[PDB]
Symmetry: D2
Subunit: 250 residues, 4 copies
């Protein structure tokens, strides 16, 4: 019951980290809408967690600005006022800054940065001043703290989310909106996508990358998000929560 009465939107909630967030949110009493681009994947995902009284799928691209106010409307029609937004949708490009095409740059930032902006802006507008204990959780990454030579655009996007989220936190706090904004920074997490890339998990598990010598699992990110969505974290805003197996500590 740690999220009793909460109503959450989890973007990119049909796979991996987002799916586990949705799963644990439902376990703790939240009602959840998960979004993703692909209907079959999303319908399967929602039903794996529960019925439509607690979780529903909505097809939506986080870069699709006009769809964001309809996503809130759909969620509120189902479950009542939204209390919790998890901006987790994202894509990656494996290119150095030097090698990044302008098309790649723009495509990644449209999802990873503009999408988070859209969800944060709308979340503040739709949740402020309602006594909801509202919480916006923006998914950055270890790549919001340190560079990676092969993730130039991705680093730009995660650094942007990191600091934009502080701006939003501060404005909400100063205006007594009853909305908190925080960032979560996963290290490497095992998912089917990582499993599809030969040698990725082993590279990420080297001690010079992850000191624990293995990578994490989606529930590792889910539980920090439960904390941040709950009223347990009512004094936490503007902060960065790193769950990375020691990656950034060395």
């Amino acid at each position: 019951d740690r999220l009793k009465g909460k109503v959450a939107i989890v973007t990119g909630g049909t796979l991996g980290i987002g799916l586990a967030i949705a799963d644990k949110f439902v376990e703790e009493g939240a009602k959840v809408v998960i979004t993703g681009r692909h209907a079959d994947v999303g319908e399967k995902a929602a039903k794996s967690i529960g019925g439509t009284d607690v979780i529903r799928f909505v097809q939506h691209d986080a870069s699709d600005e006009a769809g964001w106010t309809k996503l809130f409307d759909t969620t509120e029609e189902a479950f009542g006022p939204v209390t919790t937004v998890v901006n987790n949708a994202g894509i990656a490009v494996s290119k150095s800054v030097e090698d990044t095409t302008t098309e790649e740059w723009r495509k990644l930032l449209s999802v990873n940065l503009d999408g988070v902006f859209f969800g944060t802006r709308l979340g503040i507008q739709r949740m402020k001043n309602k006594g909801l204990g509202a919480s916006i959780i923006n998914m950055s990454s270890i790549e919001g703290f340190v560079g990676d030579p092969t993730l130039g655009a991705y680093n730009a996007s995660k650094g942007a989310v990191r600091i934009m989220s502080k701006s939003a936190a501060l404005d909400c706090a100063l205006k007594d909106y009853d909305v908190r904004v925080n960032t979560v920074h996963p290290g490497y997490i095992k998912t089917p996508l990582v499993d599809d890339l030969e040698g990725a998990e082993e590279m990420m598990s080297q001690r010079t990358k992850t000191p624990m010598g293995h990578i994490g699992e989606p529930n590792d990110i889910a539980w920090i998000c439960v904390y941040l969505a709950s009223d347990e974290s009512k004094f936490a805003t503007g902060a960065e929560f790193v769950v990375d197996g020691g990656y950034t500590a060395q």
Copy 2:
């Protein structure tokens, strides 16, 4: 049951933040030893939370090196192998660096830095390689991230705890000790000690200090510590968890 089977030492556990940590740890199924310097205060504190099957007081000064191995022994005799160490004992001096006497400097660092060292060193030795999901939680502060002109020695101590804890995290991770080490960084928290200092809460509540416009409460720190003691945070090590009402975000 989030801390089912855990056995925790909480130093400075008889007052304020430490007491609330102990309280929520017991609520979540841990057995707890709280320490403090004053018997009447500690006995009262323990009994306010529960009986001796779940919480006991041990009189101990965290600067007292020889008492630390006896504290572990006392805890283990009561409750079995220690799994969780919260190094929370600390003192403060209201002096600029310029105005700090060498006696003040040494006294504060003996508690705030040497005490954390003692507890961390011994915790690693006594908890490693036992499959306990062991967790050391070192209490830093917002004053481990930013300076305060009137807290020179206190800033030195909290910066030291911040980075020493990363060293310990990394060594434990690299050696597969099954011990995690993390730091918690409270902002201003309302306690009886703050209440005794006329004008302190209002000064700390100004928006230029705490953007939320009020200070926190001890349970705000307790709940992040429950997360960090639990197996929910098994991929978090070497990281800094800030609960400060936005203080460090601006």
Copy 3:
């Protein structure tokens, strides 16, 4: 002679911080191209510093991608191979995240983020592997470290520049390109634009903002940039250089 033989592009070099960078670069022996959007302003600016053997103006909007390869060509025709890129062009919007229009968001990021990307990408391509002691200096801000509730899009842009620059630094270092990339983070700096905004300097000079109790001057930023452009800083890459009167220290 600290920049003897260097050839620099300084974007937004016709005003304020950029102009002072150009001025001190010329003083230390560099040849400089300054860019800006307005011809009268730029021609005046260049001639205030020196003749066309040491400084020239090129009209260019940093968001204008196709103009960037012609800017390098123009600079090299004048002065020989470019060694130093200062990505300083930028704009600001005074809006919270909540209040930012999508048009404002896109306009600011086109200059502040895409422009820095363009200059960094091209700088690496055009300066690598030539033995030039090449240096890319990306202008972030104190708003790349901390939020400001009224600068949402600006914060996103500066956080992005901060971390993207580390990616670029690392790729250049790992590949032995002989290109360094670093960020500079000015605090508040007195300029004619600040002078035009009634009450701005006094607001920025309050101790709760800038602990020194006054704001800086453009030369304060110029001298850190001279260090970073020079071979004196040949071991500095991937780092953040903060010149802010103490703003971020509290």
Copy 4:
């Protein structure tokens, strides 16, 4: 002439980084006292740089509190009012936190932390309010930002110096003392001591440690210190200057 009229104390100035700081300070017009524990080493060092009109050696252990006011007196008798303090003396212990003896802990912190405290406190007292453009430069390390599993006590000391220095910066700024305080954070630097440790330079030069693929040289640290001692950096206080070949960027 970048340090014309400055009078500097450089602790641990007889070897390595400290010696190069002293060398470049003299080159730029400063008068310098270098300290160290060993007379033959210090006398040789001073004379290698210049005569007694510009550089002198004083035997002093930075942990020796009573010697610090006599060091200032000796310096002022020679050269007039001290303007610049570089707290560079330090020792290292190669032990994990777990393996650190209390004697090792205390010995290292007596030099690395107490010595910096002594020099900072006295520097503020002796240089404030004199119109000197005074500057205190505290030598931290990359080990003030990230952990190293084999440098537990050293990490504690450098984290402490990092944040204590911000306290001192802020107090000086708020009181208009005309004293700035900043930290310098070298990465790995080649010295005779590193050369004496078989395999150290190669270990430190691996790309997973230093992305540039080689370590630095003492002059790399000297030039950032010249910037910080000069009036060029009159708006820089409370900040961290990292010269590390990319170590902390990844």
